[PDB]
Amino acid sequence: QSIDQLIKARGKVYFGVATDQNRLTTGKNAAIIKADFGMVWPEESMQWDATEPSQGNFNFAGADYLVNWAQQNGKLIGGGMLVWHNQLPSWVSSITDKNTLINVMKNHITTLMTRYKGKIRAWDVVGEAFNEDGSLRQNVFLNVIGEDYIPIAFQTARAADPNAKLYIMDYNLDSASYPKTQAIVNRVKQWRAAGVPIDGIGSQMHLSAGQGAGVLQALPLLASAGTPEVSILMLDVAGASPTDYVNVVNACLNVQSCVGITVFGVADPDSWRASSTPLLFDGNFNPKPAYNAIVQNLQ
Ligand SMILES: O=[N+]([O-])c1ccc2nn[nH]c2c1
């Protein structure tokens, strides 16, 4: 049974998965995604280094493959990450003046988003912008541009494709008592009051065993920022306990603005922490207890 179809039957938009050309051409990834997931995200093919390895010199080989594959197979598409400190070429991080970095950032956002205008459900515009204590992370954008990089990024994104849901996302937002969770909510409320078009908060959810329960109160906290949507992204869970996965699903079901859940890959061996068996399919591409528990929970 398809957890995407089942979550849609509960009124959500999708159950999604991160993938890319290199996954889709091998193993059983394509077959599983066709059957069981309703949205795909590019693991790497829309990151900054993949799409703009030198200034103004873009490439969309991997991104085009995924977008066209999704269209061929009736899947929704998310894109990202437009602005964050990971997967950032040295030519960007070496910029030390505000206006150059603004222009480079705007050009990057606009070029990526306009290529697939109208076809992308959501873009992760800004990622991992917060420190653990809730202050803003001093990535190159914050240090060189200042706080206005986040307003600028979202306003540029809205102009490039007004149909796309624009997301800020971060990790370690899995407890309502954690300062980072409280800080992103306070800052997003104030940014939206300032007119920044932040449509969504995405929770980049890398759980250790037992942390699913905390999401029950963390996700409603994130939703109190007043964004139209929240989502769970890059989900994986050390040990893949049915309990942890079911708690995460229940949290999204309980939050009316939660549109869906994306897991960070199909099969355990391909995970960045494969040996913690943190995904929903095992090394034989067979559904794991956690998958079956999600099915039963959604039925
Ligand atoms: O949710 N995701 O699995 C996911 C994967 C890659 C991304 N790059 N930007 N945002 C992303 C989300």
Side-chain angles (χ1 to χ4, degrees), residues 11-296:
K12 299 303 185 179
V13 188
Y14 60 86
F15 218 121
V17 63
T19 193
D20 253 340
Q21 183 183 4
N22 77 91
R23 312 296 196 190
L24 295 169
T25 58
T26 190
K28 299 181 184 296
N29 295 297
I32 288 162
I33 296 176
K34 290 184 196 178
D36 298 326
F37 294 94
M39 184 172 188
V40 295
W41 292 77
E43 299 177 49
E44 164 58 25
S45 69
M46 297 190 193
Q47 307 295 341
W48 199 311
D49 71 313
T51 54
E52 205 185 353
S54 60
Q55 205 267 36
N57 294 328
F58 291 85
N59 184 267
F60 301 100
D64 282 350
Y65 187 95
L66 183 61
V67 171
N68 286 319
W69 186 94
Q71 292 175 339
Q72 296 159 30
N73 286 284
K75 306 307 186 182
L76 303 165
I77 310 158
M81 179 73 63
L82 291 178
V83 181
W84 67 351
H85 68 279
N86 310 311
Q87 297 305 298
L88 200 62
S90 288
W91 73 261
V92 186
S93 54
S94 65
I95 296 167
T96 59
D97 70 282
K98 169 179 174 192
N99 291 310
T100 301
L101 192 55
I102 286 170
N103 302 337
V104 159
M105 186 186 72
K106 290 181 66 170
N107 186 233
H108 186 80
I109 291 166
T110 299
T111 301
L112 266 64
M113 289 184 68
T114 54
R115 183 170 183 84
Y116 310 112
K117 186 178 181 303
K119 312 294 162 185
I120 305 302
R121 168 170 212 287
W123 281 91
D124 283 348
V125 182
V126 171
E128 297 183 5
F130 287 82
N131 291 319
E132 298 305 306
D133 65 353
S135 58
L136 297 181
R137 179 197 294 268
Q138 289 285 336
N139 60 29
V140 63
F141 304 103
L142 184 66
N143 190 251
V144 169
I145 301 169
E147 292 187 331
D148 288 332
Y149 89 92
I150 283 171
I152 294 170
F154 280 93
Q155 293 183 24
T156 302
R158 176 68 92 229
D161 183 358
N163 189 57
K165 306 299 184 284
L166 307 182
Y167 270 72
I168 190 170
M169 64 87 109
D170 219 320
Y171 63 87
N172 281 350
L173 308 182
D174 307 310
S175 170
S177 294
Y178 195 60
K180 199 181 191 182
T181 320
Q182 299 163 16
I184 192 164
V185 167
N186 290 344
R187 296 307 297 266
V188 166
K189 282 195 298 188
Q190 291 198 96
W191 278 322
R192 289 184 48 81
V196 186
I198 304 179
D199 302 317
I201 301 176
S203 182
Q204 180 191 335
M205 193 168 284
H206 301 293
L207 302 184
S208 55
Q211 288 185 339
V215 177
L216 294 173
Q217 289 291 314
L219 196 62
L221 173 55
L222 294 176
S224 78
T227 59
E229 308 180 352
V230 299
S231 69
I232 295 160
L233 296 165
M234 296 185 192
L235 173 64
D236 50 29
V237 179
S241 165
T243 297
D244 285 312
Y245 265 109
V246 165
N247 277 328
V248 172
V249 173
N250 284 344
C252 187
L253 294 176
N254 286 336
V255 174
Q256 294 300 313
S257 57
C258 182
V259 292
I261 300 170
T262 298
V263 289
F264 206 32
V266 175
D268 285 340
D270 299 321
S271 169
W272 64 281
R273 50 177 175 169
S275 64
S276 76
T277 58
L279 293 178
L280 296 176
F281 295 76
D282 69 12
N284 309 305
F285 288 102
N286 288 329
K288 288 167 66 177
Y291 188 92
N292 298 329
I294 293 167
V295 166
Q296 298 303 120

